[PDB]
Amino acid sequence: VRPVADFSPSLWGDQFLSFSIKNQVAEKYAKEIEALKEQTRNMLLATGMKLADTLNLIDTIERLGISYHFEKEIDDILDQIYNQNSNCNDLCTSALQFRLLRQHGFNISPEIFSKFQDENGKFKESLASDVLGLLNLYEASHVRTHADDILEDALAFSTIHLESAAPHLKSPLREQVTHALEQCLHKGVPRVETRFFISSIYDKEQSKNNVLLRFAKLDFNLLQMLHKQELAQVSRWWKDLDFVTTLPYARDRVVECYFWALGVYFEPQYSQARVMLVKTISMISIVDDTFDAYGTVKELEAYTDAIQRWDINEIDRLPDYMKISYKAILDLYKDYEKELSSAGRSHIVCHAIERMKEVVRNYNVESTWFIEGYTPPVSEYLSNALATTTYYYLATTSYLGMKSATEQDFEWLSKNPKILEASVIICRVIDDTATYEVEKSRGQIATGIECCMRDYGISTKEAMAKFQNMAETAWKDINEGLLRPTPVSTEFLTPILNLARIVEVTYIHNLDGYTHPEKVLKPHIINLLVDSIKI
Numbered sequence: 001v002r003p004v005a006d007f008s009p010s011l012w013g014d015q016f017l018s019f020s021i022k023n024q025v026a027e028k029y030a031k032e033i034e035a036l037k038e039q040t041r042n043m044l045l046a047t048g049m050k051l052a053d054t055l056n057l058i059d060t061i062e063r064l065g066i067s068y069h070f071e072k073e074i075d076d077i078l079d080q081i082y083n084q085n086s087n088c089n090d091l092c093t094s095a096l097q098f099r100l101l102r103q104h105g106f107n108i109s110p111e112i113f114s115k116f117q118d119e120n121g122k123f124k125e126s127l128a129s130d131v132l133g134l135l136n137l138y139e140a141s142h143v144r145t146h147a148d149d150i151l152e153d154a155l156a157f158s159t160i161h162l163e164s165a166a167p168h169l170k171s172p173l174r175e176q177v178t179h180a181l182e183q184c185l186h187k188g189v190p191r192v193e194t195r196f197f198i199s200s201i202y203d204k205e206q207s208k209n210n211v212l213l214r215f216a217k218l219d220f221n222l223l224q225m226l227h228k229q230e231l232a233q234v235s236r237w238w239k240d241l242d243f244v245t246t247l248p249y250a251r252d253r254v255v256e257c258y259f260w261a262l263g264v265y266f267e268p269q270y271s272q273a274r275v276m277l278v279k280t281i282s283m284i285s286i287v288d289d290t291f292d293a294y295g296t297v298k299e300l301e302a303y304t305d306a307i308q309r310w311d312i313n314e315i316d317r318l319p320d321y322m323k324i325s326y327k328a329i330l331d332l333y334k335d336y337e338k339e340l341s342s343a344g345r346s347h348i349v350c351h352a353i354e355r356m357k358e359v360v361r362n363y364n365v366e367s368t369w370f371i372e373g374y375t376p377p378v379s380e381y382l383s384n385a386l387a388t389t390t391y392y393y394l395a396t397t398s399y400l401g402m403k404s405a406t407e408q409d410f411e412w413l414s415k416n417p418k419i420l421e422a423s424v425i426i427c428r429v430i431d432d433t434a435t436y437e438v439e440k441s442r443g444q445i446a447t448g449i450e451c452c453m454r455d456y457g458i459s460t461k462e463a464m465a466k467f468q469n470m471a472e473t474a475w476k477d478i479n480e481g482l483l484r485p486t487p488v489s490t491e492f493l494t495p496i497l498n499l500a501r502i503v504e505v506t507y508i509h510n511l512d513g514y515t516h517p518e519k520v521l522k523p524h525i526i527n528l529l530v531d532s533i534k535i
């Protein structure tokens with residue numbers, strides 16, 4: 001016998017199965033974008049700009065999702081700002097300067113916020129009537145590190161007053177503030193925040209810059225075309241496998257998986273990386289379902305071993321259905337090796353593989369704990385549950401398609417650097433807070449919050465609160481890990497960051513976790529992969 005198949009079909013159908021680029025439009029957009037690209041550049045390279053105007057300019061270009069065209073110009077400008085470390089005396093500009101620098105690795109001192117606090121060390125209540133200042137302080141409070149205790153109350157301060165003033169603010173500011181209170185910029189998925197900013201805010205700004213707005217809308221729509229091609233290509237791939245019929249117990253969420261990959265990196269140069277990444281997320285999805293929604297203690301034990309040995313010869317050692325899965329997994333990695341041959345980078349594929357073996361080992365342990373009704377101590381729980389988030393694995397995977405990834409980068413990653421650990425913790429801890437009830441009602445007493453309660457002898461509330469501070473501490477670690485000098489180039493840190501951002505966005509709703517599939521993601525998928533921004 002097997003467990004009752006619940007998982008419902010993909011509410012997407014074949015919307016993405018086939019998409020044909022309109023080359024006429026693509027070139028038209030590309031061609032004009034090129035022009036707008038140079039106009040914008042000259043805006044950045046312009047001399048005699050005030051500090052406030054330069055920062056607002058960088059900020060706007062970043063929120064518009066077009067800053068990836070000016071990585072160097074923006075860096076040079078911020079570098080120069082960091083060194084001359086001149087002091088503007090208004091909250092708004094100081095909080096912005098602080099955020100932009102810190103997000104870019106410049107360890108600017110949080111001492112810049114001293115002039116805004118009293119002797120006691122708390123923010124001057126007299127700032128409560130400066131909305132723009134409160135807003136930028138709010139966004140800034142989210143990039144603090146363990147050494148920014150000066151900003152310990154910045155979040156509660158800016159929050160309370162922003163909530164209070166919001167109802168009477170003019171649009172789009174009102175919407176910008178309300179949105180920020182629901183999702184800070186630093187911890188949001190880049191494409192999602194860019195889509196919202198472009199069409200809900202900047203397109204309605206009275207003072208909007210038309211060149212920047214047009215540039216932003218065209219670029220976003222153009223990249224979307226690329227994304228739709230990829231998702232189409234990946235959708236055909238998923239169809240050929242046909243697990244929907246061979247492995248009926250498995251969920252069909254390739255679209256949701258693509259969204260995840262898109263959140264890791266959206267730039268066109270990462271097109272190959274994205275395709276490779278989504279294929280892996282989809283594949284490891286089957287394995288998860290197989291472990292906790294179908295396979296028996298005995299089959300899983302054999303599956304785990306087959307994965308560790310990793311050789312087709314083991315396929316016969318597995319039951320018929322696990323053969324479909326297993327065979328598909330091996331071929332996938334064989335495809336990766338073939339894709340990287342061109343650039344002679346097939347030798348890194350093994351790193352992703354050892355990470356998958358790790359995920360499978362821990363899944364198996366997870367079920368063994370389930371079967372025995374074992375409720376481990378938090379430490380033992382995390383030693384296993386961290387890897388089952390698959391984050392070490394996805395992070396490793398995201399490097400595969402990155403042309404610039406070197407063995408050194410993978411070596412650094414293999415040691416579980418602090419920035420990656422933090423990202424993993426955030427996923428684990430946020431998931432456990434969101435999926436406690438459900439898993440608890442299925443006998444999964446080896447669930448995070450559970451272990452925490454028994455371990456510490458505290459209520460479900462104190463346990464979730466404990467987990468929140470872990471997520472909080474973890475975010476501080478991520479922010480610290482982005483400060484220069486970085487152990488690897490920032491290009492390889494951003495994906496870890498983005499993985500954590502995906503977490504915050506997929507479980508924004510702890511009030512139910514909200515059926516991850518449909519709810520939560522559906523809106524974003526429609527906004528990033530279905531509807532183009534109306535010009």
Ligand SMILES: CC(C)=CCC/C(C)=C/CC/C(C)=C(/F)COP(=O)(O)OP(=O)(O)O
Binds near residue numbers: 284285292431
């Ligand atoms: C933190 C964890 C482990 C999962 C939720 C967040 C993540 C990283 C999702 C992507 C990994 C995949 C493809 C799953 F199927 C994950 O499986 P499940 O979301 O249906 O749920 P459980 O494995 O926690 O039972």
Ligand SMILES: [Mg+2]
Binds near residue numbers: 288291292363366
């Ligand atoms: Mg599982």
Ligand SMILES: [Mg+2]
Binds near residue numbers: 288289292
């Ligand atoms: Mg599951």
Ligand SMILES: [Mg+2]
Binds near residue numbers: 447
């Ligand atoms: Mg859980």
